[PDB]
Amino acid sequence: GHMVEIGELAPDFELPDTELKKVKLSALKGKVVVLAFYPAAFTQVFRDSMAKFNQVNAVVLGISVDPPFSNKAFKEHNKLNFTILSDYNREVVKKYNVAWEFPALPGYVLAKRAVFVIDKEGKVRYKWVSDDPTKEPPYDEIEKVVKSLS
């Protein structure tokens, strides 16, 4: 099975960004990385909460199971300045154990709202996973963790 814990080497993966370019996690070693998983692009509640990662001092990788084409429109609409990846085959939500089935859509597997901060050595240093998709992560704490790793 898959279980991600602090201190472990973050599971590597390669997913397409909004321009269909392959982005590999391990290629980011030497830089602090923040994985920001979200359930679905265009979820309605002005601007999506993913925009709160715009000012984080690290390489933020937004990740959802939405297709690249839609994530591109999502990224532009909400002025997200970071890389947005499409885990269309659910490979990564499984590797990070942040998968769940959407209540209203039988068999639709998507990511839980989650955040993982990875250090320059590629190890997991912070983990936050909310079963409730409406909850937002502690941005302040996350930024402080990023700082300690910079």
Query: 109: burial class by Cβ within 10 Å (0-12, 13-18, 19+)?
Result: middle
Angle at 49 between CA 85 and CA 102, to 5 degrees: 65
* Strand boundaries in the chain, DSSP class E: 14-16, 22-24, 33-37, 59-64, 83-86, 99-101, 109-111, 113-118, 124-130
CB within 8 Å of 52: residues ≥ 6 apart: 136, 139
28 within 8 A of 59, measured Cβ to Cβ: yes
From which experimental method does this structure derive? X-ray
Would you kindly state where each structural domain of the chain is located, as residue ranges? Answer: 1-150
> Which two tokens mark 36?
């920001």
In angstroms, the CA 51 to CA 124 distance is 23
Resolution of the coordinates, Å: 1.6
For residue 123, the 8-state DSSP code is: B
Q: Which CATH class is domain 1-150?
A: alpha beta
